[PDB]
Design a protein around this ligand. Sequence first.
Ligand code: CMP
Ligand code: CMP
Lengths: 224, 224
Amino acid sequence: MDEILARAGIFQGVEPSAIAALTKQLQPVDFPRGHTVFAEGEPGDRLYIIISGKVKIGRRAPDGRENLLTIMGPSDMFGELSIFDPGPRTSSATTITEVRAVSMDRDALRSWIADRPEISEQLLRVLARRLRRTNNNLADLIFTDVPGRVAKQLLQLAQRFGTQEGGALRVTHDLTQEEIAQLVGASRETVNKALADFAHRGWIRLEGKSVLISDSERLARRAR
Amino acid sequence: MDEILARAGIFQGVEPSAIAALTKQLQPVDFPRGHTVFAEGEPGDRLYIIISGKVKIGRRAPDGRENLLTIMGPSDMFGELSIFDPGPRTSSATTITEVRAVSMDRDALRSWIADRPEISEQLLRVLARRLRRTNNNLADLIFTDVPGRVAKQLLQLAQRFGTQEGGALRVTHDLTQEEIAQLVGASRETVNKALADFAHRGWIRLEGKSVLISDSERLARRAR
Ligand SMILES: Nc1ncnc2c1ncn2[C@@H]1O[C@@H]2COP(=O)(O)O[C@H]2[C@H]1O
Ligand SMILES: Nc1ncnc2c1ncn2[C@@H]1O[C@@H]2COP(=O)(O)O[C@H]2[C@H]1O
């Protein structure tokens, strides 16, 4: 599991042999599927790295309507925004499978950067990347229509969690039909038809909390 | 000049007798109104701090339509994202006034960070905060009604540019009709209907490029 940790935004760029010498006394946590690790708006000082399982990053309207910002998995950090720009959690963080993680608090995190200055530019790198992704997600809402947007999401899910079957990519995305619409940021029926059409043409084939992508090249053409 | 450069964000962590050191190294520049500093897509080795003027950071749709990510004024840093996660600019940076600014580049920047790790700690704060704002705008798009957004937007312009002018607020945003629209991520058509509604509910008034705000509460209610 040290192997999964070493793939972090933090542990990337700290001498790999020395990554052993530091991974010791962190608090390692467990969560059942469905656990609110923390809620949007509340204070918090902990940052987590996912050892195993997937966490969904949610945003909730006063109205009661839900929205998913991104899905995190093995090796992804979450809960760092309220640390770096001190303030409240910018969103809810909810487990999607059972989840093994490892957390560290604000001060523990201070030791780390002081002793291993390299971390900061990787941390900078993660937020910058996330900015880029979010910038895109945002423009997609102003500009891209639903099936176009579903295409992007499956594709993004696939670069992040996809495995190979041969020519085709497996995407065990551990999601419900409503969470997928929630990532896409549009109606549930509408996301399902967009998905049905793509299945129709054997571009994708749906199976449980999972999708198999046959024809990524056309898929990527519905994106745009 | 140097006290606007002191409130930059990069610099909120260095000795008073150091900002001067880092200020020499910097390269003064004077862009005219309607100048493109760089454009979404170009390579980027260079980051900017606006001494004065305002600049719009923008993204263009395939349809030729354009959403404005933010407006930037004295002390603001921009073009940092291609330093931390090297790649193209995610967005264009175009003046909406004459501008005098100050630039520094990837190697200059990296040298400073090895010299003074505090700079890292500060750009994380800046990035995280940028990411916090964007989650709010993004979610405004799924969750918040169309003039509902024009509220939060005017006030935010205010928070950042608002001058108390006889019990009211003086915001010289320097945005044309369309430019305000693009911040809200909408068509002039439905935006200028919030021009007219706030014109005969008398909370503002279109004076020059500027705008004078006389309300506050029937906005923080009108937004939330
Ligand atoms: N736009 C985004 N892209 C990627 N991750 C995000 C985004 N918004 C929030 N998160 C993550 O979800 C976390 C919720 O808690 P924090 O706001 O402390 O830190 C946040 C980030 O780690
Ligand atoms: N969401 C955002 N909020 C504020 N500024 C941004 C945002 N997205 C991009 N930018 C700025 O726009 C700049 C364009 O050039 P870079 O991508 O190098 O760096 C980018 C950031 O400085």
